[PDB]
Amino acid sequence: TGDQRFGDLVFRQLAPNVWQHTSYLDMAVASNGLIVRDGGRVLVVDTAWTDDQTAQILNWIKQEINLPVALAVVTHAHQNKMGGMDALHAAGIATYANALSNQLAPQEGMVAAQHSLTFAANGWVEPATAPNFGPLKVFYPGPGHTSDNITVGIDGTDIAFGGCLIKDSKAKSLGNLGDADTEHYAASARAFGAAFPKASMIVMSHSAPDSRAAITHTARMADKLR
Template structure:
């Protein structure tokens, strides 16, 4: 099925994919809650409709001296509930996302998946567990979460080997191998051909790999290629720290990671 793009904003240097359509208006909502850190106002949580039944949630954290740093996740509607891909930075933002799904979509979050053990993906686990959300992550992610002072997910996805996949809530979850982190996984929403690459995929045409503190620099490029090959039909790619784009950011990430390998 060809994707329907609603509310996707691309960097000015990127070109829209020829197969995408734009026959509906942007549907974006922002919360009204803000906080202040070192004189910089933290941006509110944002919600953007990507396609029918698929929403991007974006939380922000003020990190001096760079200012607001975004982190993306997804809300995916099902019949009478929704599933969440990743928390925001903290419990307050994540609770707001859960409330928005319940009050605006009328589809409470029932389950969630977490793409690796960093605070921008698992910083709001308490908020999910307080609402009875069934949380899922790989065994490696759960182990690393505990080591890093984060709450692990309640349930385990069987993704031990590179290239292993599981079908979860109508989504395909792949462990492509270590990249940004040893445990990073990607999630493909096949109905609208949307690939959530998380922190393994770098935004835009950047030349920076960003935070490499827990990275597998020897395999990152190969991991991106594994994800690229696994989902050849996915035309909308979501990085954690930038705007949705096309498959060009897969190619770019593999390219900028490759010098670290060679």
């Protein structure tokens, strides 16, 4: 209830101007991103697993929102986040990613975003690299899930997007591979929480939106790794 199926994708409205988009890849693994309505334009966080799935995202937006997609930001260089970059570019959408994500993308078989984000030493995005991001507040919490993994808060809402960094409050593991920073993971998770201290709805890549318990639980799980 509240979920719209659209082809093989699923869309859930989280707020008047925010939807979660979900795509699947058989390895039947879900991956979430965000769609944000900002006045006369749409902003997208993360692609779907594939170009064709991402094109469907844009199809859904055209139908349900009917506003031009101005830009997209992807939160790290893995297929579930950057797999549909070509689809974004073919639609004339300006794309942004961590400079490191763009550096890693060719090795991961991903297409690099058109623009590179860089970050101050306190983790907040450098304003000039993220021009006209509207309500999107982009924060690099430090290495965790990956070295390049970044997070996005939505001003005007209680929503913060933790991507693959944050696991749900009942997650039985962190499901990291070799590119995880198991030393700094805990601190990065907590940095994310501190960057968006008022966010009460935490959106993440691999499960439904959860409370702030997702953040503290993730950090506590990561504490066991150090």
